[PDB]
């Protein structure tokens, strides 16, 4: 009966969960963790990553 | 290795993980 309101709540929660999940994406870099990038590379290539 | 502190905001380095 109350599918419309629950649907709106689901879309908002799902969008937030996807946005949080996207931090786990390398995006074509060696790692998804910034601290690792500093701890492992020189600034000329770390800047690129 | 340094000592561990509880309930305070610190910048830690555990085995290369910052």
Per-position DSSP letters for B1-18, written without gaps between them: -----SSS-----BTTB-
CB A32 within 8 Å of CB A26: yes
Element (H, E) at A16: helix A3-21
Give A-chain residues touching B18 at CB under 8 angstroms: 35-36, 38-39
Nearest residue in chain B measured CA to CA from A35: B18
Q: Which residues, 6 or more positions from A40, have their beta carbon under 8 angstroms from its beta carbon?
A: A30, A31, A46
Write down the experimental method used for this entry.
cryo-EM
Cβ contacts below 8 Å, chain A against chain B, sum to 9
Cα dihedral A22, A27, A32, A37 sign: negative
Q: Does A12 touch chain B (CB under 8 A)?
A: no
What is the Cα B5 distance to its own chain's centre? Answer: 8
CB A29 within 8 Å of CB A37: yes
CB B10 within 8 Å of CB B4: no
Neighbour count for residue A33 (Cβ, 10 Å): 16
Q: How far is CA A40 from CA A35, A45, B11, B14, in A?
A: 9, 10, 18, 15
């Amino acid at each position: 009966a109350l599918g419309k309101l629950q649907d709106v709540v689901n879309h908002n929660a799902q969008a937030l969960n996807t946005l949080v999940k996207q931090l786990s994406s390398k995006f074509g870099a060696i790692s998804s963790v910034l601290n690792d990038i500093f701890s492992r590379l020189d600034p000329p290539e770390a800047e690129v990553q | 290795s340094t000592n561990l502190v509880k309930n305070k905001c610190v910048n830690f380095n555990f085995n290369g993980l910052k």
